[PDB]
Design a binder for this molecule. Sequence first.
Ligand SMILES: C[S@@+](CC[C@H](N)C(=O)[O-])C[C@H]1O[C@@H](n2cnc3c(N)ncnc32)[C@H](O)[C@@H]1O
Ligand SMILES: Nc1nc(=O)c2c(CN[C@H]3C=C[C@H](O)[C@H]3O)c[nH]c2[nH]1
Ligand code: SF4
Length: 230
Amino acid sequence: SMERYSHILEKDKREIVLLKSRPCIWGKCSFCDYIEDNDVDQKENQKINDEVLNKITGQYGVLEVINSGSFFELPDETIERIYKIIGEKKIKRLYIEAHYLYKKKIKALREKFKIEIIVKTGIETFNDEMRNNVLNKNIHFDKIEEILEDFDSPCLMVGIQGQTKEMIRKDIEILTKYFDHGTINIYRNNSTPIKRDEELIKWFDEEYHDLKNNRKYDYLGIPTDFGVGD
Ligand SMILES: C[S@@+](CC[C@H](N)C(=O)[O-])C[C@H]1O[C@@H](n2cnc3c(N)ncnc32)[C@H](O)[C@@H]1O
Ligand SMILES: Nc1nc(=O)c2c(CN[C@H]3C=C[C@H](O)[C@H]3O)c[nH]c2[nH]1
Ligand code: SF4
């Protein structure tokens, strides 16, 4: 079965859980097959999720919740249990993920949970045409500062056919200038038709080696590097 509970042991050490949610409200990104873990039956998702949530201890004071979609697609009972656990285990910082289409719901979530929330979002690349015409993310912003109104931490994807060195260089320039957290995901081939560019990945691995050790940004050479998921 799938690993759903682990610890992140570098940089901002924390517990992480990979939970089940109803279908991603977008669900059409050309490269994504994590949504295979979605399920329409929220009562079964809640039962599965509750066994994972029992493992949270708050031992680092920091927790990350991911769920192959956005936080808001979790069962209502899962969300309210996470809220309970935050208070009971004295957790002071929570990471969640939400697609940009949920931007306007973030403020109310922050006000409900009260603690520091780091909201991650799957920008993938700041290049508009690659993001929306190739990766089909449906993420539209006019200025970088618009993202920062509600999101804290862009997930970036590196190493996809159709990218260029210039495109990747600009993404890292933007990440490092504007954002206080972020995630660098080296692309992994999967069941979708979107494929790794091995030459770009080789180049990035050597040219941006100093990124691996940058305290602000999590770096995943393989998607399983947090210890959850297949
Ligand atoms: C649940 S999504 C992000 C949250 C939200 N649904 C969104 O898209 O904005 C998880 C992230 O994993 C990364 N990812 C997906 N497929 C990948 C792959 N094949 N290789 C590397 N990273 C991948 C992407 O950066 C994606 O944003
Ligand atoms: N279904 C499924 N969901 C996943 O999230 C996943 C992962 C790790 N994805 C994480 C890595 C960086 C992002 O923060 C986060 O989305 C590996 N295998 C998986 N399978
Ligand atoms: S990358 Fe995010 S928005 Fe796109 S299908 Fe996957 S979980 Fe849904």
